[PDB]
Structure 1
Amino acid sequence: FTGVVPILVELDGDVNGHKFSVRGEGEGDATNGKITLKLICTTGKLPVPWPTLVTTCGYGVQCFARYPDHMKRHDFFKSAMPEGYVQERTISFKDDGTFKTRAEVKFEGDTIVNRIKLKGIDFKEDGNILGHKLEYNFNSHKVYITADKQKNGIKANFKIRHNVEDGSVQLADHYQQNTPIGDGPVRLPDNHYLSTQSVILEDPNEKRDHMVLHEFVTAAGI
């Protein structure tokens, strides 16, 4: 992770029966804590607004967080490489439905690959998610990481705030658990967080339903 590593993202999902697939490619720079991704919906029109997938694909790969020198001891993500780790989540949108996600992150050659299955249920058809009322941007968060010795992994907790067009804010509770795939020693961390910032852009020469994602993540709190 000292250099620039290519990324591959594969997502197969169905939210309230609408099946969709999303494929993306980009590169992460852990040294500077940067991520860039172009993600494209291959099945046509995305049932859900793009920001709701930012965490799934984007916060999907968190190896590329920049852990400062005095905190390098707590970096589970890089510590689990190259065998990889499993990333499981329940994302519950307040007063609406629920994402439940299983993802595997590992190296396949010089490339890091993020493979996800997503299944969402109980969404209002005129609610903020299925009716596409979310603004095409993303807010700044704190991913609170904590150790789970019993599962030899970590747990994560954060509240994502999705800006709504009318000025309101759609809250999304993330409950995340990570487990390493490899038999080796991974170090399980003291309490800390990952402060995240994101911008969401467009490729003008891309006409398929897509999103261009930038992430900026640095660890803090020790």
Structure 2
Amino acid sequence: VSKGEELFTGVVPILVELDGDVNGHKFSVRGEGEGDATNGKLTLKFICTTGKLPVPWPTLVTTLVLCFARYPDHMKQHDFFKSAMPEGYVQERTISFKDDGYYKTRAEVKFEGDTLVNRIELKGIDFKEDGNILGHKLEYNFNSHNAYITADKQKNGIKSNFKIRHNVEDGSVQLADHYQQNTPIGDGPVLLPDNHYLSTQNALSKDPNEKRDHMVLLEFVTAAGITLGMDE
């Protein structure tokens, strides 16, 4: 069985690198901070290193490290993400924005030295140039949300699909339908969980002394949905 969860008992430095291309609008994001899986807590600051981000920061939150989720002691056996560590997992998504374009993402989440690294390539396709995404019509926030996790035994990993509801500035809602697959990188043993979900909250802010296009993010992720019986 896997030892990977021992890598997360303290505070772990994080590096996020994203290369993106949405309708030919190219961009890069670099994030740094730390993760505290004991509390399910992430604190990161993201910089668009290419200048102006051509999509709204909230649409990249899900793309920009679920190994930092807090799994309750009685659910530690269902934590696929840490079981794959330090070698890591590939995380792939397609995110379909309703009445608009879609993102395709491929990321590798793995330890490089002491640092948990999330390295992402993103392609966006068929967006409306004055839609909610390329038109920057979304509010700078991110609602709390529960994402269901199921095992994908035929790929030795997990999958998830879930709907993100972004608030639009006019008061409407932009749906982002997420389809996700994770598969380990190494050959070691991985935990295939029972069905459960991750409960996530996100607080987005700005650094006053930062002139670049950026996002300060505080995120909590807690696993739930598995019945704790009296057998303990």
Is the structural similarity TM-score above 0.5?
yes
Please list the CA deviations of residues 62-107 of structure 1 after superposition, one character each: whole Å capped at 9, or x if unmatched.
0000000111110000000001000000000011000000000001
- Taking the aligned partners of 1:19 and 1:133, their CA distance within structure 2 comes to 19
The structural deviation recorded for 1:191 is 0.2
- Taking the aligned partners of 2:130 and 2:86, their CA distance within structure 1 comes to 43
Q: Does 1:32 align with 2:39?
A: yes
The structural deviation recorded for 1:109 is 1.1
Q: Does 1:129 align with 2:133?
A: yes
Please list the CA deviations of residues 186-217 of structure 1 after superposition, one character each: whole Å capped at 9, or x if unmatched.
01010000011101001111101111111111
- Taking the aligned partners of 2:225 and 2:181, their CA distance within structure 1 comes to 20
- Taking the aligned partners of 2:152 and 2:209, their CA distance within structure 1 comes to 45
Residue of structure 1 aligned with 2:59, choices 36, 48, 52: 52
The structural deviation recorded for 1:7 is 0.3
The structural deviation recorded for 1:139 is 0.4
SS of 1:63's partner is helix
Residue of structure 1 aligned with 2:84, choices 77, 80, 84: 80
- Taking the aligned partners of 1:79 and 1:199, their CA distance within structure 2 comes to 28
The structural deviation recorded for 1:39 is 0.4
- Taking the aligned partners of 2:56 and 2:220, their CA distance within structure 1 comes to 21
- Taking the aligned partners of 1:106 and 1:130, their CA distance within structure 2 comes to 31
Q: Can you give the 5+ residue segments of structure 1 that lack an aligned partner in the other structure?
A: none
- Taking the aligned partners of 2:93 and 2:191, their CA distance within structure 1 comes to 21
Please list the CA deviations of residues 1-57 of structure 1 after superposition, one character each: whole Å capped at 9, or x if unmatched.
01000000100010000111111100000000000110000111110011001010x
Q: Does 1:20 align with 2:20?
A: no
- Taking the aligned partners of 2:175 and 2:102, their CA distance within structure 1 comes to 12
The structural deviation recorded for 1:157 is 1.1
2:70 alignment counterpart: 66
Q: Can you give the 5+ residue segments of structure 2 that lack an aligned partner in the other structure?
A: 1-7, 227-232
- Which TM-score applies when normalising by structure 2? 0.93
1:138 alignment counterpart: 142
Residue of structure 1 aligned with 2:117, choices 89, 103, 113: 113
The structural deviation recorded for 1:125 is 1.3
SS of 1:21's partner is strand
SS of 1:187's partner is coil
**What fraction of aligned residue pairs are identical, expressed as a percent?**
92
- Taking the aligned partners of 1:173 and 1:214, their CA distance within structure 2 comes to 23
Aligned-residue Cα RMSD (Å) equals 0.6
1:221 alignment counterpart: 225
Instruction: Report the structure number with the largest CA radius of gyration.
Output: 2
The structural deviation recorded for 1:165 is 1.1
SS of 1:78's partner is helix
- Residues paired across the two proteins, number: 218
- Taking the aligned partners of 1:138 and 1:24, their CA distance within structure 2 comes to 18
- Which TM-score applies when normalising by structure 1? 0.97
